[PDB]
Amino acid sequence: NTLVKQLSSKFGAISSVLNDIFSRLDPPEAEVQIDRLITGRLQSLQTYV
Amino acid sequence: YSVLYNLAPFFTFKCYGVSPTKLNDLCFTNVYADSFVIRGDEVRQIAPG
Numbered sequence: 001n002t003l004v005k006q007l008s009s010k011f012g013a014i015s016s017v018l019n020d021i022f023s024r025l026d027p028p029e030a031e032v033q034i035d036r037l038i039t040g041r042l043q044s045l046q047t048y049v
Numbered sequence: 050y051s052v053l054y055n056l057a058p059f060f061t062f063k064c065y066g067v068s069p070t071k072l073n074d075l076c077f078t079n080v081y082a083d084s085f086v087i088r089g090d091e092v093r094q095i096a097p098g
Contacts, residue, residue, distance in 0.1 A: 014066065024075060026068035 003048050011040035061092055 010016050013033040014025075021033050050073040062069070087095065 024067055024072065026070055026072075029068075 003044065006044045007041070009040060011036050013037050063096075065097060 008016055013021065013036050015021055016037070018034060018037070021030055025033070050069065067075070
């Protein structure tokens with residue numbers, strides 16, 4: 001349940017939905033936002049493991 | 050937003066939180082416009098924080 005609920009964290013990004021980020025901004029900021037999101041989710045996965 | 054380059058472009062045009070590059074496909078709840086006249090030096094003063 002904690003692993004599922006961790007998906008709703010912005011991790012310093014504008015939003016927690018990748019599609020909104022890709023359809024709202026221009027790539028150069030999109031890569032850094034999704035990189036922050038991916039790093040946070042990978043850290044959560046490693047902790048769970 | 051496509052029909053805006055009828056007026057001398059070369060216009061300080063800065064978008065915060067969104068990229069205006071062909072991204073007019075976003076639906077907004079209610080859009081507000083505030084217009085006035087300032088000086089050239091104080092243009093940079095118009096920004097968050």
